[PDB]
Amino acid sequence: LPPEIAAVPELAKYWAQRYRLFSRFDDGIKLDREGWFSVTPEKIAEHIAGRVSQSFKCDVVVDAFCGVGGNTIQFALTGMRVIAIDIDPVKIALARNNAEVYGIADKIEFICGDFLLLASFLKADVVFLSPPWGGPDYATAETFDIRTMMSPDGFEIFRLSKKITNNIVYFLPRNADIDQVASLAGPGGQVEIEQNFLNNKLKTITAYFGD
Numbered sequence: 001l002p003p004e005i006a007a008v009p010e011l012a013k014y015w016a017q018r019y020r021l022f023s024r025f026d027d028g029i030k031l032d033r034e035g036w037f038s039v040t041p042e043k044i045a046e047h048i049a050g051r052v053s054q055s056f057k058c059d060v061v062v063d064a065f066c067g068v069g070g071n072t073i074q075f076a077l078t079g080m081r082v083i084a085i086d087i088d089p090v091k092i093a094l095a096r097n098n099a100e101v102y103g104i105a106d107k108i109e110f111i112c113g114d115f116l117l118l119a120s121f122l123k124a125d126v127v128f129l130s131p132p133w134g135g136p137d138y139a140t141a142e143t144f145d146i147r148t149m150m151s152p153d154g155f156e157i158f159r160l161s162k163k164i165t166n167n168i169v170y171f172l173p174r175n176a177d178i179d180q181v182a183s184l185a186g187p188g189g190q191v192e193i194e195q196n197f198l199n200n201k202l203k204t205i206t207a208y209f210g211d
């Protein structure tokens with residue numbers, strides 16, 4: 001048991017599913033507490049990367065809140081050039097380690113920085129958004145409000161992302177207000193949504209914007 005894992009009872013279910021999180025976990029994958037709670041399970045990340053490499057111009061993608069690299073790794077495996085951004089230097093170190101384990105570190109440029117302040121000066125074909133939702137407690141809300149229950153504010157993250165591109169992918173809680181999420185598209189805006197499942201269990205949603 002890793003120190004983070006042994007330290008807390010609530011991390012036991014993430015450890016149990018370590019291979020659903022990273023298939024190559026035993027090849028030296030590392031995460032911290034928040035990393036465990038937040039990492040996109042591999043099958044879901046692979047699915048999202050597949051859809052992106054299908055329906056969008058897909059050369060350069062910004063992973064704006066890259067965490068431990070769950071999504072970043074999957075984008076890189078499809079051959080997209082990724083700009084991976086996280087405000088936490090520890091996450092960047094973890095993500096860099098995990099990308100190497102998967103043999104695609106060279107496909108990625110890592111930035112420790114605040115996406116909110118970088119966005120206006122970034123250029124890319126696709127922006128992928130997997131922000132903090134407020135830890136595991138996010139689920140205790142009957143309906144997740146992306147404006148009031150998310151920091152940074154979900155509409156603000158989207159507005160800044162729009163400076164970069166119209167092709168935006170938003171990774172969001174399974175109890176997210178779907179009316180709210182859809183409204184991000186604005187007037188006449190295009191949006192398609194999917195529920196992401198792991199073993200027939202509802203996990204999260206992903207919204208695909210632009211065309």
Ligand SMILES: C[n+]1cn([C@@H]2O[C@H](COP(=O)(O)OP(=O)(O)OP(=O)(O)O)[C@@H](O)[C@H]2O)c2nc(N)[nH]c(=O)c21
Pocket residue numbers: 037038039040041130131132133134135136138139171202203204
């Ligand atoms: C808290 N959180 C969770 N996730 C993702 O959502 C998944 C499910 O997280 P979960 O916390 O809902 O677990 P479970 O699905 O086991 O549900 P629970 O016991 O009812 O609470 C995690 O595997 C992550 O992929 C998260 N993803 C992002 N991007 N940000 C987050 O803050 C975040």
Ligand SMILES: Nc1ncnc2c1ncn2[C@@H]1O[C@H](CSCC[C@H](N)C(=O)O)[C@@H](O)[C@H]1O
Pocket residue numbers: 038039040064065066067068069070071072085086087088091113114115116130131132152
């Ligand atoms: N303002 C900001 N800019 C960039 N990253 C931020 C940020 N605020 C928080 N973060 C980072 O956003 C991340 C949310 S969790 C991301 C998980 C990722 N999709 C995975 O697959 O692993 C956290 O790691 C947090 O450190």
